[PDB]
Symmetry: C4
Subunit: 90 residues, 4 copies
Amino acid sequence: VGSVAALLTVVFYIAAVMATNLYGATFPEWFGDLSKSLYTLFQVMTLESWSMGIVRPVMNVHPNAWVFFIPFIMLTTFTVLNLFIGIIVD
Amino acid sequence: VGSVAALLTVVFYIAAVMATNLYGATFPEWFGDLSKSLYTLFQVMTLESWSMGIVRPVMNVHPNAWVFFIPFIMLTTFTVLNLFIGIIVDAM
Amino acid sequence: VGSVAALLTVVFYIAAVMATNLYGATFPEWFGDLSKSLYTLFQVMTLESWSMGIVRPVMNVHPNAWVFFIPFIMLTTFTVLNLFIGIIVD
Amino acid sequence: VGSVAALLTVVFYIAAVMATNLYGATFPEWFGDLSKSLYTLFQVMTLESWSMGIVRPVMNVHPNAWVFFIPFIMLTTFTVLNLFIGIIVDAM
Ligand SMILES: CCCCCCCCCC(=O)N(CCO)C[C@@H](O)[C@@H](O)[C@@H](O)[C@@H](O)CO
Ligand SMILES: CCCCCCCCCC(=O)N(CCO)C[C@@H](O)[C@@H](O)[C@@H](O)[C@@H](O)CO
Ligand SMILES: [Br-]
Ligand SMILES: [Br-]
Ligand SMILES: [Br-]
Ligand SMILES: [Br-]
Ligand code: NA
Ligand code: NA
């Protein structure tokens, strides 16, 4: 559980670093700095307007953006369930 | 677990083949080609703007679209839950 | 499990009957007939735009609408988890 | 289980008392009185338009609003999961 939450924070920070560099210049409101990118990736993790509000607008400039976002959603949500269920048992 | 992930991929692919055919011509931005259709059905599976942003606009042209999307949501949502729980149990 | 799904269908139909009578006249696009109301209550059960898209617009005309919608969400989602987990075990 | 449902109600009430105070004057439609604040925090807890529709507009005026809402989502989401699983286990 402790190791699970550690992995989640590292992946979240690494993903927000990547997102800042990729979309920061073209999408400054969402990815303009590390802070903004961490906030956006949390919104995306919660699945709130991820496609209609974030990813589809991002894909209009960067067609391959889904290669970042879809694996991120698959990875962070699977980890979150694993962490939530893992903490409940212990 | 592997068979579940295989079944989900097959079901997902056929669903996007069907959706391209049904809505492609009338909704090209969301279902105009297999790629776009795989992306939309993923958005639909996550439940993101599925009704307000996709299914209701689709229902304006195709009144029965709900016969496709509602069973799709029910089928994939039950499977993704079963798959994610399946990995957790088969690791404890 | 079989009894759980039976209860869910009855509550869903009864709720869609109630919604048609309550909001049908003022909100015809969402609750104008039993069919429309069943579709809307499914959208509301999945939590998609339930407040921003449906309930807040409904509350502008019917201030107490939340007394219908909030218990519905609480009831149908709890039942759905109970049914999903219940089927997985058996 | 009962203690969990009690803790959630207390946490929910205090959160809506705080939100009324912090955002009431600047966001009256969503946090203008305790009632509106209880309703908004329920919408936020379900994750419905929490960021695009509530938290980002709130962050335009109050840049630190995320310090309130993100821990709120994390706290209530973990509790609601724990409460719902808790009833299921304490019936099997
Ligand atoms: C899982 C761990 C999730 C951690 C989430 C961390 C969020 C950090 C957000 C932050 O530090 N901000 C700067 C606060 O000064 C908020 C930004 O999101 C903000 O600059 C922009 O979004 C603006 O557009 C808002 O008007
Ligand atoms: C858990 C069980 C969920 C069951 C869901 C049943 C849905 C039945 C929907 C239906 O029969 N319709 C009529 C099909 O002719 C669709 C309506 O939703 C439609 O009339 C309106 O929404 C219009 O506004 C669309 O343009
Ligand atoms: Br969360
Ligand atoms: Br998912
Ligand atoms: Br569902
Ligand atoms: Br809920
Ligand atoms: Na949503
Ligand atoms: Na959701």
